[PDB]
Amino acid sequence: KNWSALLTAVVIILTIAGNILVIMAVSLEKKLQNATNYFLMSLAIADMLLGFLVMPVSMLTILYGYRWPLPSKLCAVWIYLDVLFSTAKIWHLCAISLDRYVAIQNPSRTKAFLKIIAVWTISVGISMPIPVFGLQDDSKVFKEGSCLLADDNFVLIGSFVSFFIPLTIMVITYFLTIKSLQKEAADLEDNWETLNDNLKVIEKADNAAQVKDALTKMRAAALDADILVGQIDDALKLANEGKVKEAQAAAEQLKTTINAYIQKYGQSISNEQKACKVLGIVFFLFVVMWCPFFITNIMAVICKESCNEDVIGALLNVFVWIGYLNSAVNPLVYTLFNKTYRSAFSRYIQCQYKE
Ligand SMILES: O=C(CCCN1CCN2c3cccc4[nH]cc(c34)C[C@@H]2C1)c1ccc(F)cc1
Ligand SMILES: [Mg+2]
Numbered sequence: 001k002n003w004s005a006l007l008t009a010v011v012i013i014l015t016i017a018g019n020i021l022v023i024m025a026v027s028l029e030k031k032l033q034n035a036t037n038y039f040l041m042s043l044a045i046a047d048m049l050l051g052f053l054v055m056p057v058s059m060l061t062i063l064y065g066y067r068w069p070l071p072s073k074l075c076a077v078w079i080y081l082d083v084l085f086s087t088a089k090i091w092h093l094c095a096i097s098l099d100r101y102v103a104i105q106n107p108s109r110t111k112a113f114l115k116i117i118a119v120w121t122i123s124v125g126i127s128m129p130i131p132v133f134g135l136q137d138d139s140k141v142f143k144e145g146s147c148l149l150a151d152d153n154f155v156l157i158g159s160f161v162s163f164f165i166p167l168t169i170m171v172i173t174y175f176l177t178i179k180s181l182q183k184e185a186a187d188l189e190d191n192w193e194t195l196n197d198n199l200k201v202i203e204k205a206d207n208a209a210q211v212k213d214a215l216t217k218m219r220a221a222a223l224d225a226d227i228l229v230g231q232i233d234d235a236l237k238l239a240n241e242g243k244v245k246e247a248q249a250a251a252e253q254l255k256t257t258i259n260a261y262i263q264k265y266g267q268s269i270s271n272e273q274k275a276c277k278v279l280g281i282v283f284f285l286f287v288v289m290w291c292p293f294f295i296t297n298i299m300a301v302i303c304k305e306s307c308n309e310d311v312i313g314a315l316l317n318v319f320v321w322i323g324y325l326n327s328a329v330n331p332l333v334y335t336l337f338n339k340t341y342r343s344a345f346s347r348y349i350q351c352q353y354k355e
Pocket of ligand 2: 193194197
C-alpha cells in the first residue's frame with residue numbers, strides 16, 4: 001500500500017464535500033442565482049463527478065503501482081471522463097470570463113443553461129477521440145500496462161485545442177473585463193465631477209444663462225451614464241423662462257437623485273470588480289495547478305528518447321494530483337471571498353436548509 005493513497009482519499013473527500021456544498025449553495029440560496037453562479041454550480045458538478053468517478057480510480061491505480069486493475073476497455077472510458085471533466089472546467093472558466101466581458105457592453109437563467117450545455121457538448125466532443133480511438137487500440141491508452149493517454153499526438157493536440165486556446169481566450173477576456181471595469185469606474189468618477197461642478201455653478205449663479213448652461217451639461221453627463229434627465233429637463237425649462245431661483249431649487253432636488261443613482265451604480269462597479277477578483281483567483285489556481293502536468297507532458301513529447309520517460313511518467317503521476325487538488329479548492333475560494341457562500345455552507349454544515 002502507499003501513504004499516497006491516504007492523502008488522495010482526503011483530496012477525494014474535500015472535492016466531494018466541498019463541491020456538493022457549492023451545488024447546495026447555488027440550488028438553495030437566492031443571492032447566488034446569477035449566471036456566473038450557475039456556471040460555478042456546473043463547474044462544481046464537473047468537480048464532484050471527477051471526485052466520484054475519476055479520482056477514486058486514480059487512487060486505486062496508486063494502490064496497484066500504476067498497473068491498471070480494472071478491465072482494459074475501462075481505461076479509455078476512465079481517461080475519457082478524466083479529460084471530459086477537466087476540459088469542461090477550462091471551457092466553463094472561459095465561458096464565465098467571456099460572458100462577464102459581453103455583459104458590460106450589453107447592459108435569463110435559461111441563457112445560462114444554454115451556455116453551460118453548449119460548454120458540456122463542446123467538451124463531450126473534443127474529448128471524444130479518446131474512447132473512439134483508444135477503445136480500438138490499447139497502445140493509445142496503455143504504456144507498460146499503465147492506463148494513461150499514450151499517443152503523443154493526442155497529448156499535443158489535446159493540450160493545444162483543449163488547454164492552450166481556452167486559457168488564451170480566458171486570459172484575454174479577463175484582462176479586458178478588468179480594463180472595462182476600470183474605464184467604467186473612471187467614466188462615472190468623470191460624470192460625478194461634471195454633475196458636482198455644475199451643481200456648484202447653479203448654486204453660485206446670478207443669471208438664467210449660467211443655470212441653463214450648467215443644466216445643459218448636467219443633461220449631457222446624465223445621458224452618458226438614469227431617468228433624472230427628465231428631472232434635469234424639468235429644471236431646464238424652469239431656467240429657460242428666467243425662473244432662476246426656482247431652477248436653482250430644482251437642481252437641489254437633482255442632488256438627492258444624483259447621489260442615489262451614482263452610489264448605486266458605484267456599488268455595482270465595486271461588486272463587479274470584487275467578483276472579477278474572486279473569479280481571477282479561480283482562473284489562476286486552475287492554470288497554476290495544471291501547469292506542471294501540461295508543461296511536463298509537452299516536455300515529455302519534445303525530449304522523447306532523450307529524457308527519462310519513467311521519471312517524467314512518475315512526475316506526471318504526482319502532477320495529476322496537483323490538478324486533482326484544484327477540484328477541492330474552488331469551494332474554499334468561495335468561503336474566503338464571498339460572504340453568501342461562507343454563510344450558506346455554514347448553515348448546511350449545521351443541517352439547516354430552510355431559505
Ligand atoms: O485532461 C486533463 C486532465 C489530465 C489528467 N489525466 C489523468 C489520467 N492520465 C494520466 C495519468 C498519469 C500520467 C499521465 N500522462 C499523460 C496522461 C496521464 C493522460 C491522462 C491525463 C485536463 C484537460 C483540460 C484542462 F484544462 C485541465 C486538465
Ligand atoms: Mg471639476
